[PDB]
Amino acid sequence: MDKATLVKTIAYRMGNVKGQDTAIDFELALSIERLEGQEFVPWFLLSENNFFEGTAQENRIPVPRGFIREYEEGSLYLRRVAGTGKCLIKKSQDQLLKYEGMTGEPSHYSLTNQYFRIYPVPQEDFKVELLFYRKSSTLNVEDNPWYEYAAELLVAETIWAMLSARRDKMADYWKSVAADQMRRLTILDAERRLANQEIFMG
């Protein structure tokens, strides 16, 4: 679906409302903003490979712009000039204070709020790569992913907001509908991921 069909469907299923059209757009943007803030991150918010170049003597690497989380089946990889690389390992900061002053290529990291820290402090310019989840507004894709893949969740959520202001009791119903849609969306994510995968112990 697209924005026009979304607005038309939201207006139709809210009681064939016709006067309001701008509030629907406002609460449709706010619905996406609210959904991005919750704990569950769908698969379509995963970014592409991004590389960062940094100066010598700074261990702090700022977090990418729309960072929500770090991809679990992903890693921070150092790309050496020759094209080879190693995967850096995450530990807590307390655990990485032994290394201050030991010298070499970077080998470990910690995330502390807004900064990735490379504790084996490089003495020369480096380059790292990362895969992570991002807010949509920052994705480099043609249309909002949400519109294509999670359209029903979006409609219900928008309706709740609009109705809650008018004080209808229908709202709770639409919140339950949205909760069911999100519950179903979570299962697909797993299925999509776990498809054609065989697990061996050890």
């Binding site: 776990l194 697990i199 061996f200 050890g202």
Partner: protein
């Protein structure tokens, strides 16, 4: 003279061996969704297989368990011993009957 009995012995051995082959390997049955996979597949000595968030309250046993297998054809050994004694009796090379 002993051929009929020898066969009974080969049958017993082969059956036992074929049933062991099919089931005696360590294997596990589990729910793929609840765990982070790369962790399952590591042989390092101490390793924590981290559960994904949803199963935080589930009985751990339920998530991964090992299938139980038993060989019921493992007692064929007592039967082998009888047939062999009976074979010593027909041929008479080292026999029970002469003096028990």
């Amino acid at each position: 003279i002993s051929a009929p009995m020898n066969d009974i012995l080969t049958w017993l051995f082969d059956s036992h061996m074929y049933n062991k082959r099919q089931i005696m390997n360590n294997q596990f049955i589990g729910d793929p969704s609840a765990l982070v996979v790369k962790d399952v597949e590591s042989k390092e000595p101490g390793k924590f297989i981290r559960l994904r968030p949803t199963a935080y309250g589930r009985d751990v046993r339920s998530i991964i368990s090992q299938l139980p297998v038993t060989d019921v054809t493992a007692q064929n050994i007592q039967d082998v011993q009888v047939v062999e004694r009976n074979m010593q009796r027909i041929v008479g090379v080292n026999d029970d009957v002469a003096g028990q």
